[PDB]
Design a protein around this ligand. Structure first.
Ligand SMILES: O=P([O-])([O-])O[C@@H]1[C@H](O)[C@H](O)[C@@H](O)[C@H](O)[C@H]1O
Ligand SMILES: [Ca+2]
Ligand SMILES: [Ca+2]
Ligand SMILES: [Ca+2]
Ligand SMILES: [Ca+2]
Lengths: 258, 254
């Protein structure tokens, strides 16, 4: 509770500093990451921090309390739109998720969740997810994946059965879209642990389901591909449109994560 | 100003009604409600005027080009990111445009020659960009289509990133406001783009179909909108080389 409370005020303080550096006027990702790393260590010197801008690569992430932070998820959105970016924080203890935070800084909306205690949009509880079929589902997927040698071709059937397709440019906020019901599913061939660590606690708290594109479970020990959705639509995307291309997807997987 | 004022009031009042129908309940009839309300109210007050919408010589007289709800799939699935869109034309000429992001509470609007607004605030004129530093609006569905896919692949690969929001009217506005540097699709009806185009043109934006032909309200078309620079660039470096292929499609589609 002290940890949750401490973490909730940290991510809020980090948002204030982000707006300071904007109203005034990459260094900004560095600034915010250093703030969060330094603030965590000051109170908890034996916690570890897995960060994108260069904290904790080659730490056994299953040992102790681990903070997995993306200080600005959606930097292109940050640069080009001045909005639609998130601070993402996931706290794991002894390799087991405890809490997840995804803060839409410019909307001023904090999405949060404690394992077993449901998920929230600020003060509002989020509803459990209902199953959907692919043919009545909006899916999160970027156009860039569809132009890729053999992965493109595998994703085109999914795009075409899907009711429609969207792309927001923040993996953390797109996972939270699935958690809030704004998207039925979201998928990508490459994410790092800092991109999903926070969003996954929230997703799991509304009965969503996550795996990589081969159905294998996700963890913070490394990068991976991503399939997230409601359970029913996860079964359908994995079972129908991915498992038939297992061998191609395996070879792809071993090429990306080598 | 009289007509402009009428239109501004009417679209704001339509959005209010949309919400009353959400607070008490769904898309099919809400859509019908909003069409009836807008068409009926225009035709009572200006019965000489034409109203073009989903359910005529557009060079003659005053023409209202109306999408009561653009982004119906977002309406159903997200309960947000959908817009009411109204283009007004007088004697074949743009007069006014309105795109009302109902749930976000933001009316984008403009009278031709007079600037574009977000509520009461003026919008900034657009600056040029290069595709390779540009975020583009293109739906993944267009990447999967037989000859479209290969024409669009190269543009997606060179752009900094791509995005898809699911509302043509709001994606054109996103271009008008600096959020996307360009937006493109192979088909769109007059009511999807009429409002947005007026707004776009007032920030020094730039629209054509995918063959570079100018956009009119006389029928459906494909769409390329952007700041002037990256419009020139997308059309001449990436679309020009497939003119004949794009024409076959245009003729095959329209
Ligand atoms: O650089 P960054 O904005 O923190 O992170 C990126 C965002 O999540 C983006 O939407 C996704 O497409 C990329 O795969 C990520 O790398
Ligand atoms: Ca980042
Ligand atoms: Ca990221
Ligand atoms: Ca419509
Ligand atoms: Ca429409």
């Amino acid at each position: 509770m002290a940890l949750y409370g401490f973490a909730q005020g940290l991510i809020q303080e980090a948002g204030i500093r982000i707006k300071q550096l904007m109203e005034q006027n990459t260094n900004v990702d560095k600034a915010t990451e250093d703030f969060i790393f330094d603030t965590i260590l000051e109170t908890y010197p034996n916690h570890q921090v897995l960060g994108e801008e260069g904290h904790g690569h080659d730490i056994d992430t299953s040992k102790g309390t681990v903070w997995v932070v993306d200080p600005i998820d959606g930097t292109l959105n940050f640069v080009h739109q001045q909005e639609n970016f998130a601070i993402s924080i996931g706290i794991y203890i002894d390799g087991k998720p405890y809490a997840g935070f995804v803060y839409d800084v410019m909307a001023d909306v904090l999405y949060h969740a404690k394992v077993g205690e449901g998920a929230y949009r600020g003060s509002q509880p989020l509803k459990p997810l209902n199953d959907s079929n692919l043919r009545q589902s909006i899916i999160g997927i970027n156009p860039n994946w569809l132009t890729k040698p053999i992965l493109g071709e595998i994703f085109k059937e999914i795009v075409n059965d899907s009711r429609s397709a969207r792309a927001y440019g923040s993996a953390a906020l797109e996972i939270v879209s699935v958690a809030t019901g704004n998207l039925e599913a979201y998928m990508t061939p490459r994410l790092q642990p800092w991109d999903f660590a926070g969003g996954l606690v929230i997703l799991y708290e509304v009965n969503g389901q996550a795996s990589n594109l081969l159905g294998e479970p996700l963890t913070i020990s490394g990068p991976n591909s991503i399939l997230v959705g409601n359970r029913g639509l996860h079964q359908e995307i994995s079972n129908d449109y991915l498992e038939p291309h297992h061998d191609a997807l395996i070879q792809l997987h071993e090429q990306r994560f080598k």
